Amino acid sequence: PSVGFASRGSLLPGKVVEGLPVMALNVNNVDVNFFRVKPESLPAFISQWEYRNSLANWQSDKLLQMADLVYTGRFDLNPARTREKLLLPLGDIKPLQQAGVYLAVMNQAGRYDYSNPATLFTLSDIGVSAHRYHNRLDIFTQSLENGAAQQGIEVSLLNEKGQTLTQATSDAQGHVQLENDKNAALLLARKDGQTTLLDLKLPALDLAEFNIAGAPGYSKQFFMFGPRDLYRPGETVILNGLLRDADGKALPNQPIKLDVIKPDGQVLRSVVSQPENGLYHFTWPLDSNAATGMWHIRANTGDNQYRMWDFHVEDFMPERMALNLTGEKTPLTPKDEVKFSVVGYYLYGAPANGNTLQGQLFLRPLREAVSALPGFEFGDIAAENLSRTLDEVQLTLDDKGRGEVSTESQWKETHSPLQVIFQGSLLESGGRPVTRRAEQAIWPADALPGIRPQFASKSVYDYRTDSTVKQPIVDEGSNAAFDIVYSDAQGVKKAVSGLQVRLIRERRDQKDLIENEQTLDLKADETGKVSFPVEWGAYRLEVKAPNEAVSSVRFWAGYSWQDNSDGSGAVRPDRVTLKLDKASYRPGDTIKLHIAAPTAGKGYAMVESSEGPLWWQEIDVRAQGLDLTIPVDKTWNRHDLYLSTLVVRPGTPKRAVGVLHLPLGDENRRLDLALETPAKMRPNQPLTVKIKASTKNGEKPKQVNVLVSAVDSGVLNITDYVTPDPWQAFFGQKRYGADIYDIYGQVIEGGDGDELKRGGKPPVNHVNIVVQQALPVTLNEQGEGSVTLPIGDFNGELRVMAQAWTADDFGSNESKVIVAAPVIAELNMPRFMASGDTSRLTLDITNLTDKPQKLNVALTASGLLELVSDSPAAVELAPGVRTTLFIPVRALPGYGDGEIQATISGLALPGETVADQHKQWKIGVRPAFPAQTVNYGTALQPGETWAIPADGLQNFSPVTLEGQLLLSGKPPLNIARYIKELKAYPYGCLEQTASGLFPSLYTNAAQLQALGIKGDSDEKRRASVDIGISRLLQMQRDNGGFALWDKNGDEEYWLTAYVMDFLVRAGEQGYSVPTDAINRGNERLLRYLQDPGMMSIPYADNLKASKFAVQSYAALVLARQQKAPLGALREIWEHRADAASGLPLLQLGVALKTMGDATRGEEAIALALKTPRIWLGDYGSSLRDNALMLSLLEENKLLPDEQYTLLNTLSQQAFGERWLSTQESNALFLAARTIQDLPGKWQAQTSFSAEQLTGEKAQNSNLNSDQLVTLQVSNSGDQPLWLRMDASGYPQSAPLPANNVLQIERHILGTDGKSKSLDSLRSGDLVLVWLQVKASNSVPDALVVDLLPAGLELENQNLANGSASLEQSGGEVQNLLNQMQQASIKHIEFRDDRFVAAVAVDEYQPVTLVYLARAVTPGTYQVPQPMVESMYVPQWRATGAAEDLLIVRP
Ligand SMILES: [Cl-]
Ligand SMILES: [Cl-]
Ligand SMILES: [Cl-]
């Protein structure tokens, strides 16, 4: 009993019309109404309509207000009881033959439903295909069916408002060139001869199947390069630069502005770089307190289009070993055993003989099985057990440093492609791994079916998994389109017949209901396009190939509440395989292109750039292929040049696109750079690099400049660093500078360092980073030169890198130099040690001589290190043999460094004298517990002095004690942070009305503008107060009391005092309130003081407390008018014990003082500031009451010291409050509106300065323990100064677990999801450390510092290539990972001695954090407690439960 639009397209052709396609079942008569959309403001209609399937009855009023009804036509059909689709004769409708975009709303004759089927369309046989560029836009007009009517004058380009900007004609048969805008919205065709709609708001055609990728530097090229992309905090960043034009040619000496960007996006430093001999060179030191993450240097050549140079800043350890994990290139069959070949070796040139390889084998689905087909999914999504942990790998490499990893197949009957991932960790003799990942593809057949939905993927919430996930969605009652391909691993589409295309409806709340079935035949290099009528709910489209291989994609049918993925539903055109005769072309050459389209079709063939086309027209394509000539022009001096083709053929006219990069990079512009270095060398000796630049036929290397660098391979392998190539930078394939738009897809068919200070001074890491960069040299007449780089005490591999340049000639080369001693003696130690820890250090002595060696190793420990044993080892080593000495050590108490020294004897050298060798290794030591923070804050009056309390810095060790002193002229409470808007609202009930106007009695537009708060004009605000008064007066009852809405309603006792307070204050602020109303109100307030017994508050939990709050408020309002009888006040005072808050007592106190009883008045006020805080009925809270008490004290100019105490308390309460009620923000605004009205100027004389300190804003000053213990500050100003003192450092001993506001707990799980037994921990084990943080109020700036036991090392997730994955190894704690994904995390840091997370937490949302760690150095370790604290409020702090010692076994 339904009828709806089947095509859901935006354009039906004027030729082969057949009207609008409609699918009906048992519906004989259909009433359709057509509406012509108003030409003006048409983009506003499209954005509101969003190309829907149906029209909502309420939302129809707004949408159809910009469209006029032209025809009301009913249509006669003949179905009695099949759901056949049919035509709609539109040719007889004369108003529809006119220009404009139409909307058809159909309904069953006498049916009334919530929504009726609706579609937006245009009747036209015109087919435009626009091309967008950075400045211009070239449109190509055509025609549907047999004919390519190219003439195009009719181009209506409308903006966001809905006004046409330009319209003209050009080129052979017809074409048009127009000015492009950044905020352009539409494009329309023809004045009277039909209309074609094309909008720029829709995503441009997806060219994902085409190689249109490259650098976006179409303008003057600036190649940013350096010796590495990975730095440690405290290192000097080296960056070089060469500026050239679009064709790599030299240009005049111009300055380039460079900015250093932090991971948070803030700039650190800005410089103006000037070139020296055509070379740019930027150097600056990273602070030791620098943030870890992806930093970058951004360059500005002058085009204001930034050039980026990314670099990691991490606590990395250079790799001392190389690990190669190799699978098979070709996918395995489901019957095949999975095998990985392992190769490990020390970079100093020796195999990893006997080294342990620990690892994980995982089974995962291989859905993105063909890289050549991006977006195409392969395999059954409904198939179970495709994600598993296969085995834990534990093996020893042979004498050659070789091994093999294998697992028998446990997926022999799979119909879906799978993958086996080996996450292998090759371990050092100390336990530190070198981790790598290898993947093995498994294919159920040689060719598989692949599915790509043509519809967008939007983020839809799923309450079955309680997590929002982006999934391909389509509107309910609309057809779902899909691209189906039968492809091999390489991407070539194979011919197949008998594909079981099945539309399955998944159970909502029995079994999966098979909705529709199909049979598909595919041709080679053909993309199948299937469309199925979809109803509602969960769906799955599965295609089965005759070889039994099954592939399926899940999709939801329903509503979209915006939240769309950036162009997820973009049109993908059919491919036109374009072939070229030569691999590279030049200005003197002539290109011969073969256009091999799927079928015949007219359109265009051209050469493009980012500034426009260069071969504007070519129109024909005939038979099966077309070889055409393109003469490459001499003025084309750029490498962003591409080729493009378009073909169309009617049956609907199927469109196909072809795109290909035109290579213009000549090989004669490349320098033949040769580097001659020795293959092997000794440490502490200088390395010599012999450079030789040349080129064939020419052989003239005129003034060649060479920049030589040498970096440790163990640094470069972490980020698989590629040697910077200047030829590929300036001449390599640049990105496609165009965007293609066409309508063939819509055609109808039918401070700094402060976080590290809170955690504690990190121990120093003494690792050696071997990096060298010599000055740029000049090569002589022959093109010869030499660079000598001094190499220190390094044992490993060194990568020699060189960059060469002239004006247009660029070269790059690399060579590997092994730096190794005759006998290598290397010590493996943890990253740091804590006080009271024991670590088994390992010393590897390797004989790299051809002769046997006899040595003595003498060991001693200095600093905060001591040897557990004696180790007076006698070492005898045969050629190429390595031994490992176990050196157990203990870390002494305190913060500092430790050292192990080795003096080796009997080193027999050939020819050379036998002399003693010396080696030193340092380790950083720190306490095994987090730092504590002491915080002080006070306002110093002029002349007055502040000194640090004697009991303050007593628990800190002076060595690590650091502090921060912030001085300012304004209080720490910033009202703009809590109040963004302050506007009058004179409507609603009695409470709402008074609450929307109370702040409006005191502020003004000038004050709000100075505060940075949005408000009303003074005129609007005053008019609103007057409206509110007149409304409130109508709620006054005959007894003078006030009701909630009407004068006849029940009396509201607290609100009567509230509204009376408002109305009396309104009078003092220049507003008129009738005298009779005030008198009646005051008479009623007097009844409250005299008669609390007649008060009916039945919902009150504490009736006496409620009655007391009413009387005290009534008392203050009458006393401010000198109308409160002292007898009544004294009798209310006798019941003071009834108060449940300080506010009623402070109000009563002010009343007693005002009316004459200063003794009882001062007693009440003093009692109020000691009394802590429908339910109570007073609409109150602690926050509100503290702000009202503050205004009361200020207003009555009493207890200024108590005012400063409440102001600091308020600042912390506002900070910790999720949302503020109207009365809280009102009270807070009124208490803090006068503090920013004072200047920020301040003066102070301090203990740490001989010169006076002055400023106009808050100026921080870092302090050391000498300064802090004698810290004294004096106010030398005429205004009060505000000081904040934060001191941090390790205590002398470990404190006990404590918590205030915040809560933290730590638990360690194994990768099996079970609790890990902290004794049964072995060197190499991966563990999941789980933190849970809770809070009794909002902590927007919580800093989680989890100091590690020295035996645990973090798996740095930022350096994915060199570490184990949290995602892959955390499958058994997916609940915890999902909880963590929901947390608001500012940043996460994987440091040497700690895990750090900056997070927001509150009472309704506990935070879950999970991190992956590895047990490395064997020993017995102290476990520091987990810590969490607020940066702004350091008193919001928690230390988790004390844990048992951590034992790491060998
Ligand atoms: Cl080991
Ligand atoms: Cl006030
Ligand atoms: Cl802060």
3-state SS, 1201-1232, equals HHHHHHHHHHHHHHHCCCCCCHHHHHHHHHHH
**How far is the centre of ligand 2, averaged over its atoms, from the C-alpha of 1206 (Å)?**
16
**How far is the centre of ligand 1, averaged over its atoms, from the C-alpha of 885 (Å)?**
13
| d(C-alpha 756, C-alpha 291), whole Å | 9
Beta strands in 366-414 (DSSP E): 388-396, 402-407
Reported structure resolution in angstroms: 2.5
Structure tokens at 778: 């000049």
Q: What are phi and psi of 672, to 5 degrees?
A: -80, 85
Q: For helices 1182-1195 and 1142-1155, give the axis angle rounded to 10 degrees.
A: 20
**How far is the centre of ligand 2, averaged over its atoms, from the C-alpha of 999 (Å)?**
8
Q: Are the C-beta atoms of 104 and 123 separated by less than 8 Å?
A: no
Q: What are phi and psi of 1136, to 5 degrees?
A: -45, -35
Residue 1163 neighbours by CB under 8 Å, 6+ apart: 1149
**How far is the centre of ligand 1, averaged over its atoms, from the C-alpha of 354 (Å)?**
10
Long-range contacts of 1022-1026 (CB under 8 A, 24+ apart): 1022/1071, 1024/984, 1024/985, 1024/986, 1024/996, 1024/997, 1024/1000, 1025/984, 1025/986, 1025/997, 1025/1000, 1025/1001, 1025/1066, 1025/1071, 1026/1071, 1026/1072
- Between the alpha carbon of residue 775 and those of residues 74, 115, 309, 778, 789, the distances in Å are 86, 75, 21, 10, 10
**How far is the centre of ligand 1, averaged over its atoms, from the C-alpha of 321 (Å)?**
13
**How far is the centre of ligand 2, averaged over its atoms, from the C-alpha of 1066 (Å)?**
11
**How far is the centre of ligand 2, averaged over its atoms, from the C-alpha of 1229 (Å)?**
9
Beta strands in 695-822 (DSSP E): 705-712, 739-742, 771-773, 777-778, 784-790, 796-805, 810-819
> What 3-state class would DSSP assign to 1160?
helix
Q: What are phi and psi of 191, to 5 degrees?
A: -90, -50
Element holding 120 (H helix, E strand): strand 115-121
Q: What are phi and psi of 508, to 5 degrees?
A: -85, -60
Nearest 10 degrees: Cα torsion 900, 901, 907, 912: 130
**How far is the centre of ligand 2, averaged over its atoms, from the C-alpha of 1227 (Å)?**
9
Cross-strand partners of 1284: 937, 966
DSSP 8-state class, residue 1365: -
Q: Which ligand places an atom closest to the C-alpha of 1227? A: 2
Nearest to 237 by CA among 225, 248, 249, 246: 225
**How far is the centre of ligand 2, averaged over its atoms, from the C-alpha of 1189 (Å)?**
11
Beta strands in 409-512 (DSSP E): 418-427, 433-442, 448-453, 457-462, 467-475, 479-487, 496-505
Mark residue 320 as left, alpha or beta (left: phi above 0; alpha: psi -120 to 50; beta: remaining): alpha
Q: What single-letter amino acid sits at 258?
A: L
Q: Are the C-beta atoms of 1392 and 762 separated by less than 8 Å?
A: yes
**How far is the centre of ligand 1, averaged over its atoms, from the C-alpha of 431 (Å)?**
4
Cα angle 1199, 1202, 1206; round to 5: 135
The greatest distance separating any two alpha carbons of the chain, rounded to the nearest whole angstrom, comes to 119
Q: Is the dihedral of CA 682, 683, 684, 687 positive or negative?
A: positive
Structure tokens at 1342: 């919580």
**How far is the centre of ligand 1, averaged over its atoms, from the C-alpha of 356 (Å)?**
6
Q: Which ligand places an atom closest to the C-alpha of 1429? A: 3
> What 3-state class would DSSP assign to 1265?
helix
| d(C-alpha 828, C-alpha 842), whole Å | 5
Structure tokens at 1253: 């300190």
Structure tokens at 1364: 């184990």
Residue 1289 neighbours by CB under 8 Å, 6+ apart: 760, 761, 931, 932, 956, 957, 960, 961, 962, 1265
Q: Are the C-beta atoms of 1414 and 837 separated by less than 8 Å?
A: no
Q: For helices 1200-1215 and 1222-1232, give the axis angle rounded to 10 degrees.
A: 140
End-to-end CA distance of the chain: 75
**How far is the centre of ligand 1, averaged over its atoms, from the C-alpha of 1417 (Å)?**
8
Experimental method, per PDB record:
X-ray
Q: Are the C-beta atoms of 1206 and 1193 separated by less than 8 Å?
A: yes
Nearest to 361 by CA among 328, 394, 323: 394
Residue 1383 neighbours by CB under 8 Å, 6+ apart: 1399, 1400, 1405, 1407, 1408, 1409
**Residue 540: count of CB within 10 angstroms of its CB:** 18
**How far is the centre of ligand 2, averaged over its atoms, from the C-alpha of 1141 (Å)?**
21
Q: What are phi and psi of 1084, to 5 degrees?
A: -70, -40
> What 3-state class would DSSP assign to 98?
coil
Strand order in the sheet with 496-505: 457-462, 467-475, 550-558, 537-544, 496-505, 513-522
**CB burial string 1188-1207: b at 16+ within 10 A, e below:** bbbbbbbeeebbeebbbbbb
Nearest to 1414 by CA among 1432, 1398, 1395: 1395
Structure tokens at 150: 């190219």
**How far is the centre of ligand 3, averaged over its atoms, from the C-alpha of 1432 (Å)?**
4
**How far is the centre of ligand 3, averaged over its atoms, from the C-alpha of 751 (Å)?**
8
Q: Are the C-beta atoms of 642 and 662 separated by less than 8 Å?
A: yes
Q: Are the C-beta atoms of 798 and 819 separated by less than 8 Å?
A: yes
Structure tokens at 1276: 């030398």
HEC sequence for 26-62: CCCEEEEEEEEECCCCHHHHHHHHCCCCEEECCCHHH
**How far is the centre of ligand 2, averaged over its atoms, from the C-alpha of 1088 (Å)?**
25
| d(C-alpha 1012, C-alpha 1027), whole Å | 27
Structure tokens at 1110: 């009413």
**How far is the centre of ligand 3, averaged over its atoms, from the C-alpha of 924 (Å)?**
29
Beta strands in 1265-1325 (DSSP E): 1272-1275, 1281-1289, 1299-1300, 1302-1310, 1321-1322
| Residues flanking ion ligand 3, Cβ below 5 Å | 1431-1432
Mark residue 515 as left, alpha or beta (left: phi above 0; alpha: psi -120 to 50; beta: remaining): alpha
Pairing of strands 917-926, 833-834: parallel
Structure tokens at 950: 């004697």
| d(C-alpha 176, C-alpha 155), whole Å | 8
Q: Are the C-beta atoms of 41 and 162 separated by less than 8 Å?
A: yes
**CB burial string 1319-1357: b at 16+ within 10 A, e below:** eebebbbbbbbbbbbbbebbbbbbbbbbbbbbbbbbbbe
Q: For helices 1075-1090 and 1053-1068, give the axis angle rounded to 10 degrees.
A: 140
Structure tokens at 959: 């060595």
Nearest to 657 by CA among 600, 734, 572: 572
| d(C-alpha 128, C-alpha 1425), whole Å | 68
**How far is the centre of ligand 2, averaged over its atoms, from the C-alpha of 218 (Å)?**
62
Mark residue 868 as left, alpha or beta (left: phi above 0; alpha: psi -120 to 50; beta: remaining): alpha
Q: Which ligand places an atom closest to the C-alpha of 1215? A: 3
**How far is the centre of ligand 1, averaged over its atoms, from the C-alpha of 357 (Å)?**
9
Q: What single-letter amino acid sits at 64?
A: L
| d(C-alpha 1260, C-alpha 1285), whole Å | 10
Q: Which ligand places an atom closest to the C-alpha of 1120? A: 2
Instruction: List the helix and strand counts (H, then E) for the chain.
Output: 20, 88
**How far is the centre of ligand 1, averaged over its atoms, from the C-alpha of 782 (Å)?**
53
Nearest to 964 by CA among 757, 760, 761, 759: 757
Nearest 10 degrees: Cα torsion 1219, 1221, 1227, 1231: 10
**How far is the centre of ligand 2, averaged over its atoms, from the C-alpha of 677 (Å)?**
81
Q: Which ligand places an atom closest to the C-alpha of 357? A: 1
Q: Which ligand places an atom closest to the C-alpha of 1416? A: 1
Q: Which ligand places an atom closest to the C-alpha of 1191? A: 2
Residue 1251 neighbours by CB under 8 Å, 6+ apart: none
DSSP string over 888-919: EEEEPSSSEEEEEEEEEE----SSS----EEE
Nearest to 1084 by CA among 1066, 1101, 1103, 1063: 1063
| d(C-alpha 128, C-alpha 123), whole Å | 14
**How far is the centre of ligand 1, averaged over its atoms, from the C-alpha of 1227 (Å)?**
64
Mark residue 385 as left, alpha or beta (left: phi above 0; alpha: psi -120 to 50; beta: remaining): left
**How far is the centre of ligand 1, averaged over its atoms, from the C-alpha of 690 (Å)?**
41
**How far is the centre of ligand 3, averaged over its atoms, from the C-alpha of 1284 (Å)?**
10
Strand order in the sheet with 1281-1289: 932-940, 1281-1289, 962-968, 1259-1264
Nearest to 763 by CA among 828, 831, 827, 829: 831
> What 3-state class would DSSP assign to 351?
strand
Q: Are the C-beta atoms of 645 and 657 separated by less than 8 Å?
A: yes
Element holding 1427 (H helix, E strand): strand 1427-1430
Beta strands in 1104-1166 (DSSP E): none
Cα angle 1126, 1132, 1138; round to 5: 160
Q: Which ligand places an atom closest to the C-alpha of 1190? A: 2
Structure tokens at 361: 């084998």
**How far is the centre of ligand 3, averaged over its atoms, from the C-alpha of 753 (Å)?**
12
**How far is the centre of ligand 3, averaged over its atoms, from the C-alpha of 1431 (Å)?**
5
On the 0-12 / 13-18 / 19+ scale of CB atoms within 10 A, 892 is middle
Using the structure block, give the residue that is written with the tokens 């305190």.
894
**CB burial string 1091-1113: b at 16+ within 10 A, e below:** ebeebebeebebbebbbbbbbbb
Q: What are phi and psi of 821, to 5 degrees?
A: -85, 165
Q: Are the C-beta atoms of 889 and 925 separated by less than 8 Å?
A: no
**Residue 298: count of CB within 10 angstroms of its CB:** 17
Q: Are the C-beta atoms of 1444 and 1362 separated by less than 8 Å?
A: no
- Between the alpha carbon of residue 42 and those of residues 37, 103, 157, 236, 276, the distances in Å are 7, 12, 11, 57, 57
Mark residue 1197 as left, alpha or beta (left: phi above 0; alpha: psi -120 to 50; beta: remaining): left
Pairing of strands 196-199, 574-575: unpaired
| d(C-alpha 134, C-alpha 21), whole Å | 39
DSSP 8-state class, residue 1111: H
Q: Are the C-beta atoms of 913 and 1247 separated by less than 8 Å?
A: no
3-state helix, strand and coil shares in percent for the chain, rounded to the nearest 5: 15, 40, 45
Strand order in the sheet with 784-790: 672-676, 686-694, 784-790
Q: What single-letter amino acid sits at 520?
A: L
Strand order in the sheet with 67-76: 54-56, 115-121, 102-108, 29-37, 67-76
**How far is the centre of ligand 3, averaged over its atoms, from the C-alpha of 1293 (Å)?**
27
**How far is the centre of ligand 2, averaged over its atoms, from the C-alpha of 1001 (Å)?**
9
Cross-strand partners of 1307: 1330
Q: What single-letter amino acid sits at 559?
A: Y
Q: Are the C-beta atoms of 6 and 24 separated by less than 8 Å?
A: no
DSSP 8-state class, residue 989: S
**How far is the centre of ligand 2, averaged over its atoms, from the C-alpha of 964 (Å)?**
35
DSSP 8-state class, residue 1445: P
Q: What are phi and psi of 758, to 5 degrees?
A: -65, -35
| d(C-alpha 1144, C-alpha 1140), whole Å | 8
Q: Which ligand places an atom closest to the C-alpha of 884? A: 1
Residues in the chain: 1450
Structure tokens at 577: 């395989």
**How far is the centre of ligand 2, averaged over its atoms, from the C-alpha of 1142 (Å)?**
19
Using the structure block, give the residue that is written with the tokens 């600056």.
284
Nearest to 1362 by CA among 424, 279, 72, 48: 424
